[model samples]
Target: GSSGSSGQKGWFPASHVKLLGPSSERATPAFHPVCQVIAMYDYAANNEDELSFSKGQLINVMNKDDPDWWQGEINGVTGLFPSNYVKMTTDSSGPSSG
Candidate 1:
């Protein structure tokens, strides 16, 4: 019996990105692009007042104000849902995007 309980877990293949950068022990954290996603449908073209969460699949956070920019949180499964902007981190990116 080979019941591997300490491996990967998901329907999609996992990625192994390198994390050999210098470690920071500063008093705060920095804000950077965590991940990039693409939307299956472009809602802005649909003349919507704001983005429709239903239509948004993938989006890219090119800059600070790019709609997809988000901060990582530990709220739970429901918290993992998508939103227009991201909440800033502790050090560099302070305050939540509104």
Candidate 2:
């Protein structure tokens, strides 16, 4: 058996919220807020500055300087890890907090 569903990857683009509604206007929306993603698989780091975490745990992607590897922080530890090791897809509150 397989953990089915061939769904699309990546996070939701928050750009559309910049210019919507005709009643009022927004101002200076630069709050990136960083982003959180649950681990797809347990990743093991080889170097000192790399991140290591187990599966099913949520981590923060504060930096996305590269497509292959990104800088993130988990449990107060900030480091770089490959993007493929985590599934960064959450939109409109799939797993958002209340």
Candidate 3:
């Protein structure tokens, strides 16, 4: 029998995880909204403050700023990604108890 724990050293380094994206002046509120991932991305640079995710994944958009990049979190992993990669879903047919 052969063990299956031989080549599983794929943990990210400390240096690879850095806080990036918009500055304080461009920060958004503390409200987190649901968003869907329509594309796939792989973090390939140390300076780039973003994470990789598969298609059709739900993410909470932490902040929405100018330009393309947008801050979001998925599975407790927060990072920045392109705005075009996600589409906001709203429920307009819900009951309104006014």
Name the candidate that leads on TM-score: 2
Give every collision pair in model 3: none
Q: Rank the candidates by lDDT, best first.
A: 2, 3, 1
How do the residues 1-98 of candidate 1 rate in per-residue lDDT, one tens digit apiece? Answer: 24445476422223355667885455334434455544433334232223433343444333332243332222111112233433232244467777
Stretches of candidate 3 off by over 4 Å are 1-48, 91-98
Lowest summed lDDT across 10 adjacent residues in model 3 is found at 9-18
* Quality of model 1 by C-alpha lDDT: 0.35
All candidates in order of TM-score, best leading: 2, 3, 1
Residue 37, candidate 1: alpha-carbon lDDT: 45
Candidate 2: 10-residue stretch with minimal lDDT: 9-18
Please provide, for model 2 over 5-94, each residue's C-alpha lDDT reduced to its tens digit, 9 standing for 90 to 100.
458644322334555578464543433546777778888777775777889765777766567776666766766678888877564646
Cα error, candidate 1, residue 5 (Å): 45
Q: In candidate 2, which residue ranges exceed 4 Å CA deviation?
A: 1-32, 89-98
Per-model TM-score versus the true fold: 0.20, 0.55, 0.46
